[PDB]
Amino acid sequence: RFLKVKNWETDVVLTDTLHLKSTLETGCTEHICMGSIMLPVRTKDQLFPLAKEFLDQYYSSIKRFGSKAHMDRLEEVNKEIESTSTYQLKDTELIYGAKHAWRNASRCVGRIQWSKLQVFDARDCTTAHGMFNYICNHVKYATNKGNLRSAITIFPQRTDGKHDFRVWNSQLIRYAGYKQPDGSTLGDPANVQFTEICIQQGWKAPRGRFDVLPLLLQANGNDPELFQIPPELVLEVPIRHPKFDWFKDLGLKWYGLPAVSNMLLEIGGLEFSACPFSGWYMGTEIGVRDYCDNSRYNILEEVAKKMDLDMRKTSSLWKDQALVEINIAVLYSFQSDKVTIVDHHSATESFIKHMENEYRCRGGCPADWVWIVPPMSGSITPVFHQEMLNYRLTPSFEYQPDPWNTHVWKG
Amino acid sequence: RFLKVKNWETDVVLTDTLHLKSTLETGCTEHICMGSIMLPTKDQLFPLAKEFLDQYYSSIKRFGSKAHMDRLEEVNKEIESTSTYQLKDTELIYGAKHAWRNASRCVGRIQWSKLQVFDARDCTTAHGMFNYICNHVKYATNKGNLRSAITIFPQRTDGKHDFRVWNSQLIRYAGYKQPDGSTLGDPANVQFTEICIQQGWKAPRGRFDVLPLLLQANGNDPELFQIPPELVLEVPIRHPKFDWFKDLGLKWYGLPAVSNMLLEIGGLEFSACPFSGWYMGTEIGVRDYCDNSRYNILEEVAKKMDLDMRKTSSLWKDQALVEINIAVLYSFQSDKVTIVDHHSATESFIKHMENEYRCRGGCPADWVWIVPPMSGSITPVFHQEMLNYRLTPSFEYQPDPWNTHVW
Numbered sequence A: 001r002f003l004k005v006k007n008w009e010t011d012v013v014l015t016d017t018l019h020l021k022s023t024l025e026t027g028c029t030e031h032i033c034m035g036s037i038m039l040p041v042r043t044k045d046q047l048f049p050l051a052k053e054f055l056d057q058y059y060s061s062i063k064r065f066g067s068k069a070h071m072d073r074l075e076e077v078n079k080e081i082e083s084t085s086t087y088q089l090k091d092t093e094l095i096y097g098a099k100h101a102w103r104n105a106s107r108c109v110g111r112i113q114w115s116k117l118q119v120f121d122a123r124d125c126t127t128a129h130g131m132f133n134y135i136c137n138h139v140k141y142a143t144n145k146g147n148l149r150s151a152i153t154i155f156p157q158r159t160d161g162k163h164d165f166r167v168w169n170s171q172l173i174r175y176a177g178y179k180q181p182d183g184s185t186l187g188d189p190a191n192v193q194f195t196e197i198c199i200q201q202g203w204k205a206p207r208g209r210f211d212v213l214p215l216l217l218q219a220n221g222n223d224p225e226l227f228q229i230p231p232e233l234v235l236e237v238p239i240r241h242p243k244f245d246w247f248k249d250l251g252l253k254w255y256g257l258p259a260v261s262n263m264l265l266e267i268g269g270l271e272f273s274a275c276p277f278s279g280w281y282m283g284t285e286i287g288v289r290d291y292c293d294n295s296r297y298n299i300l301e302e303v304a305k306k307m308d309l310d311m312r313k314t315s316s317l318w319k320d321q322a323l324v325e326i327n328i329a330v331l332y333s334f335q336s337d338k339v340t341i342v343d344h345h346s347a348t349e350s351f352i353k354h355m356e357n358e359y360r361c362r363g364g365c366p367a368d369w370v371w372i373v374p375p376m377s378g379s380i381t382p383v384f385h386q387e388m389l390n391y392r393l394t395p396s397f398e399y400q401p402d403p404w405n406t407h408v409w410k411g
Numbered sequence B: 001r002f003l004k005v006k007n008w009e010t011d012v013v014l015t016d017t018l019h020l021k022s023t024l025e026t027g028c029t030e031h032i033c034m035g036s037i038m039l040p041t042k043d044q045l046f047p048l049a050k051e052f053l054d055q056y057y058s059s060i061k062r063f064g065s066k067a068h069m070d071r072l073e074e075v076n077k078e079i080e081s082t083s084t085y086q087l088k089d090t091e092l093i094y095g096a097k098h099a100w101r102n103a104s105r106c107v108g109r110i111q112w113s114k115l116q117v118f119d120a121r122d123c124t125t126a127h128g129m130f131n132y133i134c135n136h137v138k139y140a141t142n143k144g145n146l147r148s149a150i151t152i153f154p155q156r157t158d159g160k161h162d163f164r165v166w167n168s169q170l171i172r173y174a175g176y177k178q179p180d181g182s183t184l185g186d187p188a189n190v191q192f193t194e195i196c197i198q199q200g201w202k203a204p205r206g207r208f209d210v211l212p213l214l215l216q217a218n219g220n221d222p223e224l225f226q227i228p229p230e231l232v233l234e235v236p237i238r239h240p241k242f243d244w245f246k247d248l249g250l251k252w253y254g255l256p257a258v259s260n261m262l263l264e265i266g267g268l269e270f271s272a273c274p275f276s277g278w279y280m281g282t283e284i285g286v287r288d289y290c291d292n293s294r295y296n297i298l299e300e301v302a303k304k305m306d307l308d309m310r311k312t313s314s315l316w317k318d319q320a321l322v323e324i325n326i327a328v329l330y331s332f333q334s335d336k337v338t339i340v341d342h343h344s345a346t347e348s349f350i351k352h353m354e355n356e357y358r359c360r361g362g363c364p365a366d367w368v369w370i371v372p373p374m375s376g377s378i379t380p381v382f383h384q385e386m387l388n389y390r391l392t393p394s395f396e397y398q399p400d401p402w403n404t405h406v407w
């Protein structure tokens, strides 16, 4: 079966065959589309075809499908599974898997970069102190003095689900959020619940507006431990505006390195529950979502006031005007400090090129329109007019429940 | 089988049961989502009618009544006899309002029950259609105090006697391909602006020439009519601050009147059902003006603002996009023509969505279309999970008549 997607702006039509290699469920049916729903212990039974499917993929990619190397590897994995109930990936396979999980991430607009991923193998890690060391090294490597480099560090895979490695932080670097008795929030409201746990776990909170949260690290199913990232490793950028001098006095800054640390990496049926990865920011992530979401720092108004906008009627678009100036300031600040960032026009333009290349070289590119379109100025980016097909390929990044909701406490 | 949708800004959770009454197909499967794809007999008819009469009689608290059962037999008898059937006015109005209510892509559905339905099923000719369309336009326009309206022409019989309005909208600006290479007027209508000529129109080859109507009655060849200019309410576009904005020489019409959709009620097909409401500002300023394959004046506005158009990172496009949209809203509000901003309209829609979940058990919604084309995440709908499914009565797309007309 063939599927065609049309760019309504260029009339370019593409043909998808890759969706045939799709296994996992979308959430949708003939009768309902769940395309806007945010988030819609394995027996040897279902493990071998998963491993085999992965190894067939891997060996096809290295032009060795059906080789003796391929066949012996299937045999070895087969024997390891029935003997030990799981298996170990070679380094080559692990790197391939991690890159392809990113390549397959249908909500990621930054996928043009997928083949340049530095993969750090942390599978020999046994303790939280070990995890901290690996993560420090990741951050130092990734940050690279502002010249950001994509990287992923992969901790040991799940076994029985009782000895999981988990990074409890949703991102390696994030600001604390504190709920005040009067109902207001100090810092990042997105992090209030996590900040609380940290505090309960013995973190002494500075209680400022931009306190970098400690790492809360769980090795081998043991209770998580607190670690402070060395501040010299946390690259931060003071936000200023190129025309508005009062903007700096808002006292804003943001960290340079977006490093998502709560997702699960699935490769050949193996589950890596702690696999922090990082790239670099698209400006709107900070300027639109992190500062302007009503459920975040929500500074739209204070910016709007300082611009002396007509804030009486929404039809003055004061919210839209403030939003743009803030995003201008984020991009200005990062570029001025030589910290890698990409604006949404550049990023979506790149993604379109990537996508067309993928259709050609791969037979498709799974893409979630809902996430790919930037949170501002959607229709003046080329992705907006781009029809996209969403389907799930493995290897993949998956969500997993927050660890504090599932963790069995030792003491 | 009972579905929950979360709003991520408010944690408000809604439970949908209404999707269970869905009948048509989405284009999606368990293995692939097509959420971002724009366009995915005597025996067929009676269950379709039954289904409709069932919901109709339920809506008036007379499900399981003599009248219900009697109407059911009558329609059934009329079907087996005539191979189709006629709706009663009450049912027709009900069906039209519910087609709007069920339009998952429409952010303006909070207004769904205030729809003026104009029964034009007695119409036989293009001149007749023209008369009805002029009356619709005058009524809907209301000197700027816009009112929602639909005019419904005779239902399809056998696909040979189709009533069709060939325009995509009752009011749209001409577009001509220059010898220069680019495009004069509206690029979206170049192919239509041509068919008008190829049928006999005489373009003032201008930039904002109101297109003539091309009206097809009873399957016959379509005929050109000029909408009386005095019925076409237009708004000169100025900015409340950029005095140079006027010189760009832009205007737009007040009445968005979509005329190429097919209205399906109780199995019956109304191929000609032009309907109109009023604009959300972003439809004109974001899409009509700033789309690359439309008026595409972003660059020109940016220059007059003397923004740094050297690198995309200055966000000059975004900056200009906003000013343009401020001007549109300002221009309509000034001239006392109904318009709604995307903030108001999405806020209205969340409320409508709440109401529908309460009083109906759900509200089919297409996030891809509901979220406005600018500033999406600072509107409440961006953080709103939505379920998309097809309920009937409904508006459907239909092929362009020229591709299909048996001349």
Ligand code: HEM
Binding pocket: A098, A102, A105, A107, A108, A109, A110, A111, A113, A117, A150, A151, A152, A263, A277, A278, A279, A280, A281, A282, A285, A342, A347, A371, A397
């Ligand atoms: C290198 C530059 C990168 C850019 C500019 C970028 C950009 C983005 C953006 C803007 C999103 C949407 C996030 C949101 O709005 O919350 C996203 C999602 C995502 N990205 Fe990328 N990304 C980059 C690198 C990476 C890397 C290195 C990985 C993994 C190795 C990755 C994997 C993902 C995944 C799995 C999602 C979906 C998250 C979810 O489903 O919640 N990205 N990306």
Ligand code: HEM
Binding pocket: B096, B099, B100, B103, B105, B106, B107, B108, B109, B111, B115, B148, B149, B150, B275, B276, B277, B278, B279, B280, B283, B340, B345, B369, B395
């Ligand atoms: C009264 C004020 C109204 C507002 C503010 C409004 C708003 C909108 C907007 C912004 C869209 C997306 C259009 C686009 O971006 O191209 C839309 C779509 C739609 N509207 Fe409404 N609308 C209104 C009235 C109506 C009425 C009166 C009807 C029918 C009785 C209707 C039926 C539809 C349908 C069927 C679509 C989907 C069109 C498609 O699938 O291509 N709307 N609406």
Ligand SMILES: CNCCc1cccc(OCc2ccc3ccc(N)nc3c2)c1
Binding pocket: A110, A258, A260, A278, A279, A280, A281, A282, A285, A289
């Ligand atoms: C603001 N939307 C957050 C919703 C959400 C929920 C769970 C995970 C999640 O990850 C977003 C995400 C993931 C990977 C990224 C990689 C690079 C980058 N610049 N942003 C990235 C952003 C995002």
Ligand SMILES: CNCCc1cccc(OCc2ccc3ccc(N)nc3c2)c1
Binding pocket: B108, B256, B258, B276, B277, B278, B279, B280, B283, B287
């Ligand atoms: C710019 N998108 C155009 C795609 C498209 C194709 C076919 C029909 C169509 O209708 C949009 C539409 C329908 C009804 C409307 C009612 C009111 C309003 N302000 N806009 C409305 C807009 C829209």
Ligand SMILES: C[C@H](O)[C@H](O)[C@H]1CNc2nc(N)[nH]c(=O)c2N1
Binding pocket: A008, A384, A385, A386, A387, A388, B036, B037, B038, B368, B369, B370, B371
């Ligand atoms: C490819 C994509 O489906 C297409 O550009 C859609 C996206 N969302 C839209 N949303 C609205 N409201 N109107 C549109 O015309 C479109 N076009």
Ligand SMILES: C[C@H](O)[C@H](O)[C@H]1CNc2nc(N)[nH]c(=O)c2N1
Binding pocket: A035, A036, A037, A038, A370, A371, A372, A373, B008, B382, B383, B384, B385, B386
């Ligand atoms: C309900 C909806 O799916 C949710 O708000 C999504 C919308 N699109 C998004 N798109 C991106 N890139 N990031 C997001 O967090 C979201 N949130």
Ligand SMILES: [Zn+2]
Binding pocket: A028, A029, A032, A033, A034, A035, B028, B032, B033, B034, B035
């Ligand atoms: Zn879907």
